[PDB]
Structures are given as structure tokens and as C-alpha cells.
Amino acid sequence: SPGTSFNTTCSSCTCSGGLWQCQDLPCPGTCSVQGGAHISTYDEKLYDLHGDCSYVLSKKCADSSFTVLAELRKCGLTDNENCLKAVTLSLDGGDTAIRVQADGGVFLNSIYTQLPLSAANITLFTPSSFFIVVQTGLGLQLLVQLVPLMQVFVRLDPAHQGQMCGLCGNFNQNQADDFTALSGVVEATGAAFANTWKAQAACANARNSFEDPCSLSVENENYARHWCSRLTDPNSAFSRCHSIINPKPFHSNCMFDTCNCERSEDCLCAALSSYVHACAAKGVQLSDWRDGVCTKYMQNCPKSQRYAYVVDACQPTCRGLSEADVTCSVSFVPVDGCTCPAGTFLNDAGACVPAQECPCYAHGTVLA
Amino acid sequence: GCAAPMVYLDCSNSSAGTPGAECLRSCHTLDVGCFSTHCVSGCVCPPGLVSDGSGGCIAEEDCPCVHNEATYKPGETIRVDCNTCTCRNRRWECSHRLCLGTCVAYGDGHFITFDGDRYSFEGSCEYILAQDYCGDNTTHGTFRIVTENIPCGTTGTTCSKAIKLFVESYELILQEGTFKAVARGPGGDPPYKIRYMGIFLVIETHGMAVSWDRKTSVFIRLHQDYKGRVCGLCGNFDDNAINDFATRSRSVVGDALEFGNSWKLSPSCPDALAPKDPCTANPFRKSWAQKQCSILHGPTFAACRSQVDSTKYYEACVNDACACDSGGDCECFCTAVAAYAQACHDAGLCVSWRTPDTCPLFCDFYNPHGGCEWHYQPCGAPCLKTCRNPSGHCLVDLPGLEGCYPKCPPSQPFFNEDQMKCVAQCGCYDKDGNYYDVGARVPCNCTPSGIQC
Amino acid sequence: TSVFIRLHQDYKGRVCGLCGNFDDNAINDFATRSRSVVGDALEFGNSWKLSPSCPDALAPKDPCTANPFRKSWAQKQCSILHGPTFAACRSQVDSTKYYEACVNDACACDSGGDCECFCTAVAAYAQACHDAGLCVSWRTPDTCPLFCDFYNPHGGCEWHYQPCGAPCLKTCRNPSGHCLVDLPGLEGCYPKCPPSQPFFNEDQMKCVAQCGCYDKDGNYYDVGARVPCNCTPSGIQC
Amino acid sequence: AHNGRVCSTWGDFHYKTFDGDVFRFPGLCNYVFSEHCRAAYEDFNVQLRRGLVGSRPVVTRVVIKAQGLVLEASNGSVLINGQREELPYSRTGLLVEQSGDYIKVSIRLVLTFLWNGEDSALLELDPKYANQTCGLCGDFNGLPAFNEFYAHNARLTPLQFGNLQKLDGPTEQCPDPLPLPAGNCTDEEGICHRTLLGPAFAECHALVDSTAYLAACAQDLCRCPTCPCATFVEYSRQCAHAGGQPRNWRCPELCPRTCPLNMQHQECGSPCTDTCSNPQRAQLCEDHCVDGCFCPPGTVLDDITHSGCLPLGQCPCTHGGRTY
Ligand SMILES: *[C@@H]1O[C@H](CO)[C@@H](O)[C@H](O)[C@H]1NC(C)=O
Ligand SMILES: *[C@@H]1O[C@H](CO)[C@@H](O)[C@H](O)[C@H]1NC(C)=O
Ligand SMILES: *[C@@H]1O[C@H](CO)[C@@H](O)[C@H](O)[C@H]1NC(C)=O
Ligand SMILES: *[C@@H]1O[C@H](CO)[C@@H](O)[C@H](O)[C@H]1NC(C)=O
Ligand SMILES: [Ca+2]
Ligand SMILES: [Ca+2]
Ligand SMILES: [Ca+2]
Ligand SMILES: [Ca+2]
């Protein structure tokens, strides 16, 4: 009706003048590398990258304030079977380094560091067992997925808009300028642009891939189709997001991954998780989407923990309820994963107990 | 332990962490800045110079420029879109000529908006492909382009299109393979010019040139003036492709179906339903489709695949060859490939696929009894010394595009479209654009001057 | 997909197979392997299969009935046979069964390659007209085009589409210019080889001055090349 | 003839590529037995799965993908595009049959796949597929010893080579066969040398070298002693395919074969058995020797009522499906 308004997560529109008067609320941009090969830039220019090197994923190219680096490694017999293997946030002109590996190990200046950590305005913590959040004060925030495989999501405070460089593009709301290399000309294809951002000159240039992995094995075809079709099903759990995010690139990603992945279940569940997380980024809460699929990620949970479809904030710790927590005031898009059940907290031993079983910490001294 | 000026470097003497041969100053890594936790021993150019990557050494002011899976020496030139660049100091310096923006609407409903966006919308009613009649005033705009999908022998899958080029108070209907004129407003001189560019009808308006393949492909090229002030199904030309799905009431949606359903001319028309994936519907075509569309991955299109991204063009080709289950298959495949052909043509290349086995184009037809002006050119002349344009100049100089043209000799130097031949002297075009021979009276006679009395 | 076989009158009555027995008696041309004249086409075809292991073809199915949604298109495409393009030939060659064939073929090709089906169905009638008395030229740019500029290299304009080709071709393989079984005109494009380059070469499809050589198996080489003797004005000599 | 357009798989995991190589590879998963993989669009994709019957090495499933047609042969049954079909099944360009002792799938202008049903499997490929294939059958470039086993300029062992051309199921993780330790036995009694170098394959010595086949015969002798004739059968097939005329080597003790009462078991019989339905099919045939049941000369086959091979003047006629 006239007088009504509706606000998207990125904009707000009022029904008036017979039209929609739309203004744009601030929106933190979001780059991502999914499947180990596909890249969604800040300008939302999806393109696949089959590379074997470390690539400058994103960098405020006026200076060297930060440089999020991604190392992508070949993982199979074929040259287009890739996996993300690390995420190396280089900082202060390389003076600081936070390296999130693929198994979850996080290295601060090449020294193993358990999580959470909080120093130099940098906060590292695991919202759940599936994700690692590296919240820096410089403006950006990294959110790295480990389970089932390694994917990265980079969030930018909109102030950097029209300033960045690297693989994820300059963040200027223009999809045609993303391939602007340092030579001032837009590159043609994805790989031609990426082979300008390799870290090491000795790396092998990426190549363009037309060979659909789906055409090779018929059983791979039937399996991948029968499951990845759940994306585009209008009756499916994902359907709620269809009217916001077009699921066709996600379906193409799921097809390519599963038909090419060695543990094609892993890449299938990774693609479905990627679509779910992108939809939650837009502001849709997909729940109970793992019906008869990807349940081995429910079962493998660490003892005393349980899966949770919506981890929308802090991991509830006993230390925090004792003496507060600087880790736990960070806004991140609600990710899924294994967590202690609500009302329960994890003690320093890592086990999960209710509040009554956990000591209060005064001066860091245990008090039953 | 090397031969060229580049000398060996070993990490045994240096403390761990120094930049080894992997962090070698090089024409690529001189600029980005190398990262590595491990030193490597190897041959590295002496300080002050970098390496070409082939064991040589080069001054840093002569590093080859890399562009599109290629490499260019300093002093070599390239052409990108409408401008030209030259390689200097690992950079490209390009002229600053404005480049004509391009909308594409072809096939079963594939659209490439002005801002580079791509989507598929299978509508049936009349849809506004472009217009300046949208803004805080709709009445300060000039032109308007509507399209809708004609079935050429039935009421089924699309076979051709129909364009309604409204240009101020005029109107042109592009259908069945020719044009018309339904000028209803002021009866002055036409604000458009008409040309037969190869296998295209091309209409110029001094700032906006339309090209129709006469079957189903429409490519529009706009001047930079109209930026941001257009709308319809080619986006709003704002160099921002995320918001190009802006409906009638300017409420950017994430779905192409609603974006299309907004721009239907008649609100009485029913909205298009969910498009259904073609190859799934007709699996028995699918295999053939791929075999036909594989032309894109073959050595015919080897070079262009590094100059234009062809993933989406291939997907459109396969979907169109799968969809055309009611007849006219070669036309579907031909136009799906020819959109990529034109993209290659516009980027930098003169690609000529068109094998007699694959999408042939009868161009001997206009040859009269051995007269051999009519030759097939993969990239045509920018402007044609046509019968209608005796000057030889043009308003919107379009680049090369496929089609066969007459090499009109000096003895008969006028290309006449209405008869498609090289002739000595032209006739006359009235206000509506009908043609007559010299010396013939118009409903005044025809002379070297034209229609006079 | 079309084969036209033209025999001398010598072989009359002594041939067999799917082209009948050439006896000027069309009723009994359905003579199977054991010469048991049948009133059915399926048995006559099933007789002449090379390998008896092969399965017999089942009942052929009427195309247009099978796929009605093509039929209209097919007719609109096949209506070319009734239009003024073939107005003259329809009085010289009966075109009923040709039209039925065109419609059936354009209805049948539902898996891809429709233009080829329609083109060959019409081209059978085109050759019937060509042999009868008429040089009919339908082949419009909209309808069954034939790329013939292709073999024209860089503005060379020998290769032209003639609706009825010369009875014999002065080919590279036949430098004499004579022919054994003089076929009449038939569609396609031919090169107008000029006196400076009066030899049409098929292995490159071009008018050239001097020809190369063909061996016993029929492979081609440029002059001055040894063969697995060299190539000379004589040819393969040693 | 079919000089180097053949690859084969027989007996105790013995693989022979197009260009003449032989090697044993005891894999037990699905493998890309051959595939058009150096073309913009692939024409054929034939894969093998090798398994165990108690202890016998067998082929348990073949999946031929060609030009949009899927053909899964397993469990004595054939699946055509996902549907079981009764032999023979014929279509434009395709025909699958129970011809002779095997299952033969011929995709005209593409391939000819013979599958004996338990252990043997042989591929004939068109000459136009040279250098564009890749798989256990090799590259079809004609050079045997130099280009199959160089993975980025490094030479591989047959175990590694067969492991490169591996393809897991969607939910399957099949291991790799750990190398077999040293052998024993060899040809102590001399049966392999006596037969292979004997009279029968005399001219076969002029076309196909027997060294690898001698080794394989000895190695099979190390396995069960009712299964040493697989290598002789394969050598007969290869000699016939090169062009030479193999001679009858089978004796009532050397893996005896049986055929119907009027049909004799021959090595190198004419492939096109004349049969008084087409009693002169064998006139101008083009196909090399083939093994199987055949008829004594003069009495063509009777395919009309299957009374065995019958004299030309005592076999029935057919009119409209009626037997006379
Ligand atoms: C979004 O719109 C709703 C509905 O009018 C409103 O209640 C809410 O406050 C809005 N959000 C804002 C203004 O941030
Ligand atoms: C945060 O950043 C500021 C700015 O460089 C620095 O001075 C400070 O030490 C950092 N840490 C904290 C806890 O403020
Ligand atoms: C083959 O299929 C039959 C049923 O058709 C089944 O009984 C048998 O176990 C299968 N395997 C073998 C080796 O016969
Ligand atoms: C076969 O392929 C290889 C692969 O590069 C190539 O080097 C060689 O020239 C090819 N030879 C033939 C005869 O095809
Ligand atoms: Ca951008
Ligand atoms: Ca826009
Ligand atoms: Ca007769
Ligand atoms: Ca080789």
C-alpha cells in the first residue's frame, strides 16, 4: 500500500509517487573463493580460476595496509582439480602475518597460535567448528570455512570501495572493470587476469578450462545431478532464497565440483554450504536443508558438542560469563557448524558442561 | 654456476627467510611483491636488472607487457575495443576515445545489457528493449526500442523477432526481414539513416546505431551521451551491472523473470512463467547440440577464446540447439555462434568460421551471370557508399561485421540495396523511403538531382 | 545422404538389390533374395541385408503422426515445391511423392539437422527437374544456401554456383578434359578456371596452372616430390 | 588390415596397447580403458572394471559412452541408455550382438568392442582417432615404446601407468594394487615355446612378436593350470588382426572347444558364414580370420529353422514369415 516501505539488507525502498523511492544503506562488500576454483569478486563477477600458486586475493593497492593472500594448489590427476590450501593475511606491509591453514591450524608470524587470540586489534576465533573468523581493525574481516573443505569469505567496510586491487577486484560497483590489471587494461578471461596476480614468478600460469568433468563418468553424472538439483528445486529448502539470489551459478559450481571432486560428497556439501552461506549473507535463514544429505557432518561432531544450523553470534564460553570477552562483540554473517548447546558452556578443558558445573574466574584464578 | 649475467644464489650462507630465487625480480614480480617462507637456490639476475623468465636479463624499463595470455615487446601496439594501446614501462598507454556502449538481445532471449550483465528471459509479449522515456521527466527522452518474438511458420518456439524503433515522432517496424515507416508526428526529414551492413539492417541516429540480423539478433551501440539515462531490458547504462535488474517502479530485483515482466508494453498481457531448461526437456537433442556447439572450443575459435570469455556463449548455444524442437535448427545454432562471432569481431579480431558444412551463407546469389562484385567479408567496411548515402560518410561508424558486400567497381560505384547490385547512377528515395528508377514520376520526376519538379 | 546411380542400357535385367532388377517391369521389382516377389516394402528391404545376423527392421512409423508439432513447419518448408519457384517443373516432373517425402523427412528429423533433411528432400526433385529438361535454381539465401565463396581465395572469383554443371570437368586427375560416363548438369558450384590457371584441382579445390601427381592408390603430391620416383611434368616418373 | 588399430585385455590382467606394448597391471577398480581425450568434442569413452571370480581375473563391467549412447555390459546383461535390451540390438550406426562366443558392440565409424564375457576384451578403433585417444590402450600415435609411459618427461612402471588412468565411483575409494613379488615356474615343460613357436602360428611370427606372449603364458602357468590358453587365444586374435592366417592349435588336451553337430570349431574361419538365406554372403567379404563355429565347405548355415549347417538344396525358403 502507499506509505509502506521495505528494506533489503543492502537498500531500503518506499512505495511512493507510484514508484519505488530507493536509497542505499551501507553494504560491506563480500569477496569469496569457493570450491577452490571459483571466485566471486566484490563486484559479484563470478569466474573460475584453476591455478597452482599463491594469489593476491585482495589488497588495498594504494598502499600495503593489508594483503589477503590465497594459495591454491592442484589436488588431482587433472590440472583442473584444485583446492584452497591456506589464507595468509599479510599485514602492515608484511610485518604481521596470520596464516589459516586447511586443517584449522592458525599461525601468527609462522608460530602456532591456538584460538581465540586478541592482539594488535586483531581477533581470531572460531564461531563454530566449521569456521574461523579473523576480524581485523583495518576494516576487513576474513571468514574461512574448513568443514567440509577450505573456502574463504572476505568482508570489507564500504569505505574501501573503489580502492582495492587483486583477484577480488576494485570494489567499485562495476563488473566490467574487475579485470583491470596493473597495466591499465581489462584482461579478457578470468585466468588471463589471475596470472597477473601470482605471488611467485616461478608459478605456473593458470589455463582456461572447457572440459566439463561431468561428461567423463556416467555414475558421477547421475549422482551429481540427482543431488545438486536440490538447488534449483522450487519445492526445496533452498527455494526461499531463489527470489533473491539467482542459484544458476551455484548449480554450475555444484555440478563442476561434484563431477570433478575426488570425494565428490565433500565438494557437493561444500557447494550447498556455499549457497546457504551466501543466502544468509543476503539475509535469508535457510534451516533444515540437510535432509538425507551431508549428515556425516552432523555425526562427526566433537564430543559434548552438537550441530547447529544458525550460529549467529558468540560462542558461549564460561570464561566470558565470568569476565567478559573482547572476542565476542563481532558481527559476522550467521554461519553453521558444531557448537555447545544453548545454556551450556565449555570449560578450559574444552568439554561442555552447564553453567552450574563451571568455576568463576577471579584474577584468572579458578574458583569452584 | 650460471652463464648469463644472472649469477647463482644459495641459501646456505644467508640466514633463513631471505628472498630466494623464487622471489626473483622479474617482469611480473617486480610489481606485485613476492611472498615465500622458504629461500630457494637458483640463478638470479644481478642487481639493477630483472629476468624475462627465460634465463635472460633485462633492464627494468624494458619489461615485456603481458595481455590476454600473450606477451608484447616494448613498442608493440594492441587494440582494445575502440581504442589503441602501446606497451611502455610495463604499462599500457591508450588513446582516450569514447567507446560505443553495446546491448545485445539474441537467440531464445539471451540479453547482454549495456553494463556487461548477462541473463536469459523467455518472454512472449512486447518488451521495451531500450528507451530514454524514463526519468523524473519521461518526455525529455528521444528514442524507444521494443521487441517481441515472432514465430515464423507456427505459434511455437521463436523463429524471428519484431522491432519497433520509435525515434522521436517517427516509427520503424523491423519484421519479416525488412523495415517500414509509420511516421505519424511532424513530417520533416528522417532523424535516422538506413544501411545494409553485411547481413544486418543497421539504422543510425547520429548517437545510436541498431543492427538487426534480420532473423533474431539485435545489437545496439549507443554514444556515451545516453549514459545513465536509458532503461528497459538493456539496463540503464550506468557501468553498474548489479542494479541493472531495475523494474518499472525502479526496485532492483535479483530475478530476471520479474525484471522482464516489468517491461511488457501492455499490462493486459500475461506474465511469462518459469523458463524451463531446454536440454532437460529434450535430452535426445542434447548430444547433437553439444556436437554442434563444440565449434566454439575448436581451432576455428582458438584465438578468440583468449580474447572473449565464451562460457556463457557456449551455454546459450547449447540451450538454443536443445530448445529448437519445432524446426529451424541450423538457424538457432547459427545465430548462437554468430553472437560470439560478433563479440570477437568487436573485440579485436576478424574471425571467419562459416564453413560450407557449418552455417553457410549464400553470397553468390546477387552475382549476375558471372559478375563477381558480391564477396563474403568476415568484417565489412565501416561505411558503405550506398544508393541512399551517395556521400559515402556515415553517422555512427560501425566496425566490421559479418556479411557479404559488393566490391562496387569504379565503372558502377553505387551499391543499391533495393536491388542489391553495383550500379552506375542511383535513383531517388522519397520521404517514406520508397525507391524509383530515374525519369519515373513519384506519387515530380527522377533525375540526377533526385525527385524534382 | 542421396545417391543417384546411372547405368548404361547394357546392364538391363541383370542387376538386383534395392534398385530393382532394371527390367522395365516395376510391379515385380519387389523381388527378394530368393526372387519371391512380395507386395510389401519391409520384406523386400529385409531380404538384401548383408549380414543375416542383423535384426530385421520393424514397421516404419509415419513421421508427421509421431511428432505433430513439426508438421506445420514441415509443410511451410515443403510448400516450396508448390510455389512459383517450381511452377515450371511441376508440369514436367510429377511432384506428389516428392512432396510426401519432403514432408515426411522434415517431420522425422526431430533429433537435429533439420535444414539438411529438407534440403536433400527438395534436392532430389531438383535433380529430377535437372535431368528432365530444366535448369531450375531455387537455393535462395533464406532457403538451403550453399556457401560457394569459400573456395574463393582473397578476391579470386572463379568459384561460382552453376545450377547445371558442365558435362565433364577438366580436373587435375583428368588432364585430358574428356569423360567416360557424361553426366548432365547437376547442382553445386564450379570454378571458371581461366586460361592462365586452366586446371581444376580437387585436392585443393582451386584453379591452378600445372597439376601434381596421383599414385596407384590415388594420393596427391605437389610436383617435385618423391613418392613412397619424383613428381615432374610427366608426373610420377623414374 | 587392422594393423595397429587394436588394443586388448586378457587373462591375468594383461593389457596390450594399440602400438604393440604389453604389460600386466593387477588393478581392481574402474579404469579409463580408452577415451577420445585430445579433441574438442569426445566421440567414445570406454571403461573397464576388473574383478575376481573366486580367484580368476575377470572383467565385471564395461561402460562404453559414445555419441550420447551409454552401454553398460555386466552380469551377462547389456544396458542400452539405461534400459535392458535383448540381443541383438541394432540402430542407425550401432549394433550389439551375441555373435559367436562373445558380445560384440560395433559403433560404425567409431569402434568395435569384443567382450568374451569373462576375461577378454578387444577394441578396434577408426584410423581417424590417432593421437587423440588416451587410456590404457595408449595414444594410437603408432610409436609403442616411447610415448605411453612419459608423464611429464618421467618414465613410469605399468603399475603407475595403470594407476594414472584410474576413475573412482562417486562414493567409492578403491585402493591401488601393491606390486606383485617375484615370479616362479617359467616354462619348465616348454608348453608355451612348443605351441607359440610351433607350426600353427608360423606366419604369425612374421607379424606379431611372441616374446611378451611367451612371458604371459609362463606367468599364467604360475597361476592355475586350466587357464594357460588365454595367451594363446589372444595371440590367435592378434595374428588374425594383423592379417596373418593362424592355424588350428587346439587339441583335445589344449583347452578343447566344442561346437554343434554340423558346426566345427575353427581358428581362422571366414567371418561371414554363408547361409542359404544369403548363401553367397562370403563372396566378396572384407574381414580377417575369426575364430568360432563354422560349417564344412559346401553346406551353408541354415538360419531359417536352425537345423545346423544344411546342404544348399535341402534348406527351407521363407515367404512372408512362413517357412517352406
Ligand atoms: C525496515 O522496515 C520495517 C517495516 O517498515 C521497519 O519496521 C524497520 O524499522 C525498517 N528498518 C530500519 C528502518 O532500519
Ligand atoms: C590498535 O591499533 C592502533 C593503531 O595503530 C595501535 O596503536 C594499537 O596498539 C592497536 N591495539 C590496541 C589494543 O589498540
Ligand atoms: C547374473 O545375473 C543373474 C540374474 O540374471 C544372477 O542370478 C547372477 O548371480 C548374476 N551373476 C552371475 C555371475 O551370473
Ligand atoms: C601426435 O601428438 C603429439 C603430441 O603433441 C605431437 O607432438 C605429434 O606431432 C603428433 N603426431 C601425429 C603424427 O599426429
Ligand atoms: Ca569493480
Ligand atoms: Ca545498472
Ligand atoms: Ca522388375
Ligand atoms: Ca605412443
**8 Å CB contact between B39 and B14:** yes
Q: Does A351 touch chain D (CB under 8 A)?
A: no
Stated as kind and residue range, the H or E segment containing A323 is helix A318-323
Q: Which residues contact A111 (CB under 8 A, 6 or more apart)?
A: none
CB-based touch C/B (3+ pairs, under 8 A):
yes
Select from A69, A189, A255 the residue whose CB has the most chain B CBs within 10 Å, as the one to mutate to test that interface: A189
Q: Does C68 touch chain B (CB under 8 A)?
A: no
Q: Does D67 touch chain B (CB under 8 A)?
A: yes
Distance of residue B180 Cα from the nearest chain C Cα, in angstroms:
20
User: Using omega within 30 degrees of 0 as the cis cutoff, is the peptide bond preceding C52 cis?
Assistant: no
Stated as kind and residue range, the H or E segment containing B316 is helix B311-323
Q: Amino acid identity of B158? A: T
Q: What is the DSSP letter of D206?
A: G
Which subunits sit against C, judged by 3+ Cβ pairs under 8 A?
A: B, D
**8 Å CB contact between A298 and A307:** yes
Q: What's the rounded Cα separation, in Å, for the pair D309 and D298?
A: 9
Q: Which residues contact C31 (CB under 8 A, 6 or more apart)?
A: C16, C20, C21, C37, C44
Q: Which residues contact B189 (CB under 8 A, 6 or more apart)?
A: none
Q: What's the rounded Cα separation, in Å, for the pair A36 and A38?
A: 6
Per-chain residues with Cβ under 5 A from ion ligand 8: D 139, 141, 143, 147
Distance of residue C128 Cα from the nearest chain B Cα, in angstroms:
22
Q: Does D112 touch chain C (CB under 8 A)?
A: no
Residues of B in Cβ contact (< 8 Å) with D67: 287, 291
Residue in A219, A224, A258 nearest the CB of D169: A219
Q: Which residues contact A186 (CB under 8 A, 6 or more apart)?
A: A176, A177, A178, A179, A180, B80
Q: Could you tell me where the beta strands, DSSP code E, fall in A287-327?
A: 306-311
CA dist list (Å): A335 to A276, B200, D140:
9, 53, 52
User: Using omega within 30 degrees of 0 as the cis cutoff, is the peptide bond preceding A148 cis?
Assistant: yes
Q: Which residues contact B219 (CB under 8 A, 6 or more apart)?
A: B102, B103, B104, B105, B106, B210, B211, B342
CB-based touch C/D (3+ pairs, under 8 A):
yes
Q: Give buried/exposed letters for A192-218 (b at 16+ CB in 10 A, else e).
A: bbbbbbbbbbbbebbebbeeebbebbb
Q: Which atom of ligand 1 is nearest to the CA of A4?
A: 5
Residues of C in Cβ contact (< 8 Å) with D278: 33, 50, 52
CA dist list (Å): B270 to A230, A301, B123:
29, 51, 10
Half-sphere exposure of B67 (CA within 13 A, CB side): 25
**8 Å CB contact between C191 and C161:** no
CA torsion angle B65 B70 B72 B77 (round to 10): -100
Stated as kind and residue range, the H or E segment containing D229 is helix D229-242
Instruction: Name the closest-CA residue to atom 10, ligand 2.
Output: A120
Nearest CA in chain D to A265: D171
Nearest to B264 by CA among B175, B148, B161: B148
Nearest to D119 by CA among D229, D230, D10: D10
Residues of C in Cβ contact (< 8 Å) with B321: 112
**8 Å CB contact between A89 and A190:** no
Distance of residue C139 Cα from the nearest chain B Cα, in angstroms:
8
Joined grid coordinates for residue A250: 551455484
Task: Report whether residue D131 contacts ligand 4, using a CB cutoff of 6 Å.
Answer: yes
Q: Do A217 and D170 touch (CB under 8 A)?
A: yes
D143: CA distance to ligand 8 center in Å?
4
Residues 303-332, chain B: which have Cβ within 8 Å of C? 321, 325-331
Q: What's the rounded Cα separation, in Å, for the pair B156 and B152?
A: 9
Q: What's the rounded Cα separation, in Å, for the pair B249 and A80?
A: 44
Residues of D in Cβ contact (< 8 Å) with B298: 40
CA dist list (Å): B234 to B113, B170, C204:
4, 22, 46
Task: Report whether residue A118 contacts ligand 2, using a CB cutoff of 6 Å.
Answer: no
Q: What's the rounded Cα separation, in Å, for the pair A254 and B131?
A: 38
Nearest to C147 by CA among B334, B301, B380, B364: B364
Residue in D45, D164, D169 nearest the CB of A216: D45
**8 Å CB contact between D155 and D149:** yes
Instruction: Name the closest-CA residue to atom 7, ligand 2.
Output: A120
Helix boundaries (H) for A10-76: none
Asked whether residue D241 is marked as a ligand-binding residue, the answer is yes
Mapping DSSP to helix (H, G, I), strand (E, B) and coil, where does residue B82 land?
coil
**8 Å CB contact between C183 and C6:** yes
Q: Give buried/exposed letters for C148-158 (b at 16+ CB in 10 A, else e).
A: bbbbbeeebbb
| Phi, psi (rounded to 5 degrees) for D162 | -65, -25
Joined grid coordinates for residue C166: 558442365
- The D69-74 sheet, strands edge to edge: D30-35, D44-53, D56-66, D69-74, D77-80, D83-84
Q: What is the DSSP letter of A167?
A: T
Mapping DSSP to helix (H, G, I), strand (E, B) and coil, where does residue B150 land?
strand
Q: What's the rounded Cα separation, in Å, for the pair A331 and A337?
A: 17
Nearest CA in chain C to B289: C112
Instruction: Name the closest-CA residue to atom 3, ligand 1.
Output: A6
Q: What's the rounded Cα separation, in Å, for the pair C125 and C131?
A: 10
Q: Do D167 and A262 touch (CB under 8 A)?
A: no
Nearest to B232 by CA among B265, B266, B191, B268: B265
Residues of B in Cβ contact (< 8 Å) with D40: 294, 297-299
Which subunits sit against D, judged by 3+ Cβ pairs under 8 A?
A: A, B, C
Positive or negative CA dihedral for B54, B59, B60, B66? negative
Q: Amino acid identity of B171? A: E
Q: What's the rounded Cα separation, in Å, for the pair D103 and A341?
A: 60
Q: Do B328 and C73 touch (CB under 8 A)?
A: yes
